[PDB]
Structure formats: structure tokens, C-alpha cells
Amino acid sequence: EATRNAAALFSVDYKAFLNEVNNLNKRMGDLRDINGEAGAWARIMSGTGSASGGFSDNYTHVQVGVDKKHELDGLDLFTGFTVTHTDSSASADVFSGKTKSVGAGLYASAMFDSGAYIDLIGKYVHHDNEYTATFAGLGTRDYSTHSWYAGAEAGYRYHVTEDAWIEPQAELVYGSVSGKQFAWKDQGMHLSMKDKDYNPLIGRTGVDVGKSFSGKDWKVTARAGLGYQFDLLANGETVLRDASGEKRIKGEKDSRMLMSVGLNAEIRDNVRFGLEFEKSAFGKYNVDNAVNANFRYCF
């Protein structure tokens, strides 16, 4: 059903918004064991996933930016600005979309000597997607709209031992994006398709242990643990019309799980080793992940 296609598109948009989440301590720079007062940084990654009924997607997201920071009486204040761009391609039974969400925002991050760090990010992007769909007579349509979302998080990387730090953390994010309003007159019937002002929110709780290895012989960032993400708000209401009647739809909560990072290894100022761990929990909602492994060295 074209309503099912629209619901799948809304779920894909929610997944993209969740992916718009980047690591506070890894992608956004660690608040602990990072003495970089001012400097530039970047992080580029890729992901892949799927759902039931043949829905799947693959995306690449790259972000960069700069930051300034200074210490205080037992506190390390930090802030900065960044930009990001996430391109994605999703394949379904009757829907094939190519989306691009490029934007920018600002972030803050502070930590102390007592083992507590507070981080936050927030950015606005412009999601524009060319989607080819047969059901409802959508054709090849370009749905473009802005989307501003900001999240906050708090972690406590307490010293579990001399070779690891135990970090419990929580996060909560709120985001708003304009709906996809277009006419389905290409199908013969009116079938007006539009959505209300979506204002999704999502919280998450995650625990981890991080190996603070050094010595240029270990020099790795081994981490383990688990985290669970539950939607704080799902207000993605949309309206569809048909000859027999009209319908309205909205979103519900989620119970997504997570995993850890594989190696994230290095030795010296000329070697960097990478390896990612992925999970494909097809039992719950036919979910999946994307992982990679590479390393860089020069003579």
C-alpha cells in the first residue's frame, strides 16, 4: 500500500535522524583524556541497515568542524562548531529513494577531575530526497525540507581499574522537521499526502568500559558494553486521502539495541588501525549494521 510506503519512508527518516547522532566521546571528541583546548577535527563513517519486507538502506555520513576550550577550577569547559553531510540510498519493494541531508550546528562539552562529563550537540540540515515510487502514483518526486535537531548527554567514566574506565551514560535528543506535502494526482485520484510538523524525540541509556591503553605498544582504545535507545517522542502524523475515505497515521516508540567498537587501534604517530563490530538483530525488526576494518601507514 502507498500508505505503507509512506510509513516506511517515515521510519527511514526516523532512522536517519537517529543516525544523525554522532559519538560525544569519540566522534565529538572525548571530554576525558583530551587536552585539546582549540583545534579542528573531523570524522567520516558509513552505515547500512534494513527492516522487514525487503526495506534496506546504505548511507555515508561525514562531518568536520573546530572547537575551543579552556580549563577552570577543577572543570574543563569546551565548545565548538561543526558541519555534517549524510547521503543515503534506500531500496524497497516499490520505493527507491536517494536522500541527502547536509547542514551545520554547534556543540558543547565539559568535564572535571571528579569523573563526570556533560556533552551536547545540535545541528540543522536540509534533507532532500528523490524517491521513485509506484504505489499512489508518486513517480520520481523530490521531497526537500529543513530539519533542526539537538541532543544532550551525560557520562561518568569512573576508573574501574588501571587499564579500563567504567562509563555509565545517558542521552536525550529533540528534533523538528517539516513534513512531506505533495499531491498524488498522477494516480488519477486526488489522494492528498501531507504530514504535520514532526517533532520526534529519543532518549538512550548506555554503559561501557574503555581500555586506556598506552605505551606505543598497546596504544589502543578498546571499549565494550551495551546501550538501549527508546524514542522519547514519536509525533510523525501524516494524512492520506482515498475515494472510500481518509486516514491519519503517527509513530510509536522503539527499543533499539546497540553494540561496541572492534579494535580502534594504533601504536605511534604514523600507524592507525581500524575495525568495527556490527550487529544484525533480525529477530526484532530485521535490523542490521555496517562495519569496516582498515589501517594506514606510510614509509
Which residues have CB under 8 Å from 241's CB, separation 6+? 189, 190, 191, 192, 193
CA distance linking residue 32 with residue 164, whole number of Å: 13
Q: Which long-range contacts (CB under 8 A, 24 or more apart) does 267-273 make?
A: 267/216, 267/217, 267/219, 268/216, 268/219, 270/297, 270/298, 271/295, 271/296, 271/297, 272/296
CA distance linking residue 161 with residue 85, whole number of Å: 38
| Residue 145 and residue 160 in contact, taking contact as beta carbons nearer than 8 Å | no
Declared resolution, Å: 5.2
Residue among 149, 178, 155, 195 at smallest CA distance from 18:
149
Method: cryo-EM
Name the one residue in this structure whose C-alpha cell is 577543577: 74
| Residue 195 and residue 179 in contact, taking contact as beta carbons nearer than 8 Å | yes
Which residues have CB under 8 Å from 201's CB, separation 6+? 172, 173, 174, 175, 231, 232, 233
Per-residue three-class SS string for 141-202: EEEEEEEEEEEEEEECCECCCCCCEEEEEEEEEEEEECCCCECCHHHCCCCCEEECCECCEE
Secondary structure element (H or E) that encloses residue 214, with its range: none
Give the 3-state secondary structure of residue 6. Answer: helix
CA distance linking residue 16 with residue 97, whole number of Å: 13
CA distance linking residue 18 with residue 149, whole number of Å: 10
CA distance linking residue 190 with residue 192, whole number of Å: 6
Cα(first)–Cα(last) distance of the chain, in Å?
58
Cell numbers that stand for 120 in this block: 551536547
DSSP codes of every residue in 19-78? HT---TTTTS--SSS---SEEEEEEEEEEEEE-GGG-EEEEEEEEEEEEEEEE-SSEEEE
